[PDB]
Symmetry: C2
Subunit: 214 residues, 2 copies
């Protein structure tokens, strides 16, 4: 190799740092989004809606870093794979953040009214999903198949849990159509948790590609 | 002063761009069949959309593996490397559109086992726009047409607006006889998928802007 070959190294270990940061900010979104939604708390919602902008540039900035690294250093097979993969996931991660930002909106909408039901399921879902966000992005940065496979296993649960939700609400709507307004908002929410999870699972799918690459 | 890598990278990039187009045809074809299967309560048509989604899946990989090939072998500079990464990004949005139409098709099955519940003028105006959004977004990409990409970005607000019309129309159905609760919700999801397909369409046009703004 040549002199500045270890530049690509530093540049890449940093870019990775940033992915991890961006994911810290995603879990923070979901966590805030769930509190707001739960305890009918708008300060917590507007917080989450402001903070998404951060996550937005984080996509831009990590993407731009990838191109740079490829343009400047000409990374070999392994690096180039690590990089294009980063390039993919930073998008999924941005989508999770946007999904949470959506739960944040809804929670505002659900605040000008009594809950209509304990949010127990939304909650079990919420908890599984953050675990999924984290574990998925860990298993990527460090080539952990087993951990990626677990994340992929958990998704069938979120799916399964989502369906529980679809049906409980059917019964709420059916017992008093007034309830139609909350039911629906609480439907979306569940759909958003389910989208965040599906995404999580991509990161993991990616993590395998990478790990299978060795 | 030469270098035979130039000419190869050119063919490879054009052949890939061609692949991307193949892929958007199939997505348009998907949305199209799925709307027929939805409307005409036709499961033959739906199971088609559903097997046909696999073709689109492999095209994502196909093109993605193309992009890495092209970078590794030819060490492409500025404009080229940019179109490639960009191809890489949008071959995905496009796979997501096909995924959403596949979902429309799954619901069409489900909706077949019962009367309509309503004509579906809305869902129809929606996909008709959406389908044209898929095309234009991917045209605008291949030839960096900013003005055409921005036309796409506008239409999206229409889908957005059209989507909302639809959830209120349904609210009224559920409200009139909760039996309708099952058809209503299925039609609810469908109306969301159309809106997701449009929102992806709109990413591609954003991308098309990245490329264009660049040259």
């Amino acid at each position: 190799g040549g002199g500045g070959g270890m530049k690509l190294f530093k540049e890449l270990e940093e870019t990775k740092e940033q992915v991890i940061k961006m994911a810290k900010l995603v879990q923070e979104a979901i966590d805030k989004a769930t509190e707001a939604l739960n305890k009918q708390n708008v300060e917590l919602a507007e917080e989450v809606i402001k903070g998404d902008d951060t996550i937005d540039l984080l996509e831009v900035d990590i993407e731009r870093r990838c191109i740079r690294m490829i343009a400047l250093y000409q990374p070999e097979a392994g690096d180039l794979r690590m990089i294009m993969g980063i390039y993919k996931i930073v998008s999924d991660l941005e989508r999770m953040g946007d999904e949470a930002e959506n739960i944040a909106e809804r929670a505002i909408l659900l605040a000008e009214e009594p809950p209509l039901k304990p949010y127990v399921n939304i909650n079990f879902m919420s908890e599984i999903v953050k675990e999924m966000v984290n574990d998925s992005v860990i298993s990527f940065i460090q080539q952990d198949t087993l951990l990626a496979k677990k994340v992929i296993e958990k998704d069938d649960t979120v799916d399964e849990l989502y369906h529980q939700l679809e049906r409980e609400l059917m019964t709420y709507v059916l017992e008093d159509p007034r309830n139609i307004k909350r039911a629906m908002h609480l439907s979306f929410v569940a759909r958003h948790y389910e989208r965040i999870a599906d995404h999580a699972e991509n990161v993991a799918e990616a993590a395998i590609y990478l790990s299978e690459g060795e």
